[PDB]
């Protein structure tokens, strides 16, 4: 299989769209910032444009686990170096062992060391950190906190080789060892830092110290018990600040020079106002008395962001109660860079959209600018450039600081022959009409939905669409190409909605196959539903693109045709089929042309409504299959798949109905898990849209 050069980019959703559990500033170089994602890789900040650059897109589908970024560390001695601890699950959802990724060009290129254990980039407690730390006196040395009782690990050769710190007392009882803080003043440059603090997720004993360069460890005397330490920050005056959660929360400061512990919780832990962890912790590098903490999670009315200018003695919240319903905001939020963030919904007070956020497990003050601050949420990164205005009684001007991040899990995609070039169904954000591929949409389809799981349009009436979702009734229809949506009075039988949807070519019937439920048809736009005869749970249903009477289904190793608009299905008795399929899809303009994406079972085609199929011999793996405009002079639409051809993983195009294939991605453009949706563009030759699981929507075009 040969390759053809492509130009790859994200379709813009804007503002990230997911949870980025950590932000890491470099201690010595101004404007050097990194951000880590849970499913979503890592990014470096470009300060010239206020954008983030993705760093791990070279990982192919067999290394999707390495988009789970447990920790990121940036070298203070040599800011060119950056390390990632990578691995998404500590269980068997993915087979990969965890890895330490190492770069000397700030994440443009990477080497890795495979570890004898797994990371949990997408596991509970992921915003606790940073687990990975570089010695600021001797950058040869790195420490790593681990999950699952593996404890504290160390490298003394710039992260190339790793061993367990056997003398470390407590791996946790498993969220594990959660952060490593060096005390730079304990040694002089060139020498191993002698004093190291370590935070461990154990309510009974959480804070540990070595004073001999990691040879022996003792628990810090006088420490609080009962909660878990989310972050530790050693300020320039010798105060170690630590945030705690379980909810309930505390904030403490430990005097490293005297040994004294002082409780500095903004809201007293014996107060019943205290009903959340404090999680995010920021200390101003230029003034060790300036600190900030965040709640996780108050939920109502919004989260708390507390600021102290006197080392925690006194705090002010970023909002205050007034004449209830009613709150005094010492902030604004500007969401011009990702306008979907207000959910297109005005709230009744004291709630206000857009919110400060939720899942605020990390907050950072720029070590070179007291006015710059950033924090994470379950949907975006926010930040400001006028932070100290708050101290003078002005408003913190918060804005989206996640431009360039695309972290959505994309569940389905269509490229209609009329209207917008793309319409999406995504996790968490439902999905969007993409009027313009490089313009972020203003609002998702249906604000009351949580995830859009399936979408289709009537091929001959492309302004008609159906969207299925989790959350209100969980199917929506549109007659204006997704600009406006409406819900029916009734749903197909279901437990959690979701699943998939197939729309008749003539817009006269819709088959909803909800998650863990049977296909059901409506000729009513959802007024009434009928379970499709002869099908059931797990059936893979697709509509014919020419004939509105014809629908297709793969179900329990058999293929089925419907010729009455999806009311009844008949086993076609196809002599040769795969054992299972992931996706099936019919061809626009070609009646009875049905393609089967059977993962490792390959790619199959029929041209007779699924009575006979042919397995294409030149394709090993096809996870998904889609179509776009025919190549000039060709009489079949271009076919796009993800999977494997001739021991090469990637994305492939065929301009001759599957007779020959070229690879359209490369080694630098993997994008991880790509087995949910693919489509070409019926109006633009060579263009392909691909759903990823944590890198949003990607599209490619032939390069010049």
Q: Experimentally, how was this structure solved? A: X-ray
At how many Å resolution was this determined?
Answer: 2.1
344 with 325, same domain?
A: yes
For residues 13 and 407, give the distance between their C-alpha atoms in angstroms, rounded to a whole number.
9
158 with 264, same domain?
A: yes
183 with 276, same domain?
A: yes
**Among 375, 407, 439, which residue terminates a domain?**
407
Is residue 570 within a helix (H) or strand (E), and if so which, with residue range?
Answer: strand 570-571
368 with 446, same domain?
A: no
β-pairing verdict for 540-543 and 530-531: unpaired
Domain count, the chain: 2
8 with 21, same domain?
A: no
239 with 253, same domain?
A: yes
CA torsion sign for 414, 415, 417, 418 is positive
Query: Based on the number of CB atoms within 10 Å of its own CB, is 190 exposed (0-12), middle (13-18) or buried (19 or more)?
Result: exposed
68 with 151, same domain?
A: yes
Query: Based on the number of CB atoms within 10 Å of its own CB, is 349 exposed (0-12), middle (13-18) or buried (19 or more)?
Result: exposed
467 with 443, same domain?
A: yes
Domain housing 213: 17-407
For residues 118 and 91, give the distance between their C-alpha atoms in angstroms, rounded to a whole number.
8
6 with 76, same domain?
A: no
436 with 565, same domain?
A: yes
DSSP 244-306: EE---EEEEEEETTT--EEE--SS-TTSTT--SEEEEEEE-SS-TT-EEEEEE---SS---EE
* Residues sharing a CB contact under 8 Å with residue 392, sequence separation 6 or more, in sequence order: none
DSSP 170-184: -------EEEEEE-G
**Among 378, 407, 436, which residue terminates a domain?**
407
272 with 379, same domain?
A: yes
* Residues sharing a CB contact under 8 Å with residue 614, sequence separation 6 or more, in sequence order: 604, 605, 606
CATH number at residue 256: 2.130.10.10
Tell me the three state secondary structure of residue 390: helix
Query: Is 38 among the residues known to form the active site?
Result: yes
Which among 675, 589, 692, 598 is positioned nearest to 638, based on CA atoms? Answer: 589
User: Is the peptide bond between 301 and the residue preceding it cis, with omega within 30 degrees of 0?
Assistant: yes
| Inter-residue contact 468 to 497 (CB < 8 Å) | yes
For residues 462 and 651, give the distance between their C-alpha atoms in angstroms, rounded to a whole number.
27
The catalytic residue among 428, 524, 564, 620 is 428
**Among 385, 407, 429, which residue terminates a domain?**
407
DSSP at 619: -
CA angle 596, 62, 125 (to 5 degrees): 115
For residues 266 and 190, give the distance between their C-alpha atoms in angstroms, rounded to a whole number.
39
610 with 650, same domain?
A: yes
């Amino acid at each position: 299989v040969t390759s053809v050069p492509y130009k790859w980019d994200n379709v813009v959703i804007g503002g990230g769209g997911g949870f980025m559990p950590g932000i890491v500033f470099n201690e010595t170089e101004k404007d050097l910032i990194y951000a880590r994602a849970d499913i979503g890789g890592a990014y470096r900040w470009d300060p010239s444009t206020e954008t983030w650059i993705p760093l791990l897109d070279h990982f192919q589908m067999d290394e999707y686990s390495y988009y789970g970024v447990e920790s990121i560390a940036t070298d203070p001695v040599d800011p060119n170096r950056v390390y990632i601890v990578a691995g998404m699950y500590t269980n068997d959802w993915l087979p990969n062992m965890g890895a330490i990724l190492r770069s000397t060009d700030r994440g443009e290129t990477w080497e890795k060391t495979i570890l004898p254990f797994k990371m949990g980039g997408n596991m509970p407690g992921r915003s606790m950190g940073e687990r990975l730390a570089i010695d600021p006196n001797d950058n040869r040395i790195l420490y790593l906190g681990t999950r699952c009782g593996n404890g504290l690990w160390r490298s003394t050769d710039y992260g190339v080789t790793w061993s367990k710190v056997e003398s470390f007392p407590n791996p946790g009882t498993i969220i594990g060892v959660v952060w490593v803080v060096f005390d730079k003043s304990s040694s002089t440059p060139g020498n191993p830092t002698k004093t190291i603090y370590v935070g461990v997720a154990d309510k009974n004993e959480s804070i540990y110290r070595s004073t001999d360069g990691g040879v022996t460890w003792k628990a810090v005397p006088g420490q609080p018990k009962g909660l878990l330490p989310h972050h530790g920050v050693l300020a320039s005056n010798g105060m170690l600040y630590i945030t705690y959660g379980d909810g309930k929360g505390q904030v403490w400061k430990f005097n490293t020079r005297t040994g004294e512990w002082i409780d500095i919780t903004p809201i007293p832990y014996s107060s019943s106002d205290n009903r959340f962890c404090f999680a995010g912790l920021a200390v101003d590098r230029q003034n060790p008395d300036i600190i900030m903490v965040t709640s996780m999670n108050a939920w109502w009315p919004d989260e708390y962001i507390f600021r102290s200018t006197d080392g925690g003695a006194t705090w002010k919240n970023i909002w205050e109660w007034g004449m209830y319903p009613e709150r005094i905001l010492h902030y604004e939020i500007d969401i011009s860079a990702a306008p979907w963030l207000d959910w297109g919904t005005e709230k009744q007070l004291p709630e206000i959209n857009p919110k400060l956020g939720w899942m605020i497990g990390d907050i950072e003050i720029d070590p070179f600018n007291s006015d710059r601050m950033m924090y994470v949420t379950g949907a975006t990164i926010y930040g400001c450039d006028n932070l100290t205005d708050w101290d003078r009684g002005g408003k913190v001007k918060i804005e989206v600081k996640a431009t360039g991040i695309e972290e959505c899990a994309v569940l389905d995609l269509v490229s209609p022959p009329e209207g917008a070039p793309l319409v999406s169904a995504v996790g968490d954000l439902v999905g969007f009409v993409h009027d313009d591929l490089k313009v972020g949409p203003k609002k998702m389809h249906v604000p009351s939905y949580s995830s859009g799981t399936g979408i289709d349009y009537a091929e001959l009436v492309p302004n008609f669409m159906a969207l299925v979702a989790k959350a209100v009734k969980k199917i929506s229809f549109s007659y204006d190409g997704g600009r406006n949506w409406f819900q029916p009075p009734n749903e197909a039988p279901n437990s959690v909605g979701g699943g998939s949807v197939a729309v008749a070519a003539d817009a006269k019937s819709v088959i909803w196959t909800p998650e863990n439920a049977s296909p059901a048809v409506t000729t009513d736009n959802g007024n009434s539903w009928k379970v499709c005869t002869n099908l059931g749970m797990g059936a893979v249903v697709a509509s014919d693109r020419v004939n509105g009477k014809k629908f297709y289904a793969f179900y329990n190793g058999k293929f089925y045709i419907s010729t009455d608009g999806g009311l009844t299905f008949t086993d076609t008795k196809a002599p040769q089929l795969p054992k299972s399929v992931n996706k099936i899809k019919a061809v626009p303009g070609k009646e009875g042309h049905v393609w089967l994406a059977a993962r490792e079972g390959g790619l199959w085609r029929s041209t007779d409504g699924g009575y006979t199929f042919e397995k294409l011999s030149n394709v090993d793996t096809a996870h998904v299959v889609g179509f776009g405009k025919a190549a000039p002079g060709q009489d079949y639409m271009a076919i796009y798949i993800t999977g494997k051809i001739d021991n090469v993983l990637g994305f492939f195009r065929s301009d001759d109905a599957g007779k020959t294939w070229v690879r359209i991605n490369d080694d630098e453009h993997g994008y991880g898990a790509v087995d949910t949706a693919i489509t070409g563009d019926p109006r633009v030759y060579g263009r392909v849209y691909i759903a990823t699981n944590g890198r949003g929507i990607v599209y490619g075009e032939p390069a010049s």
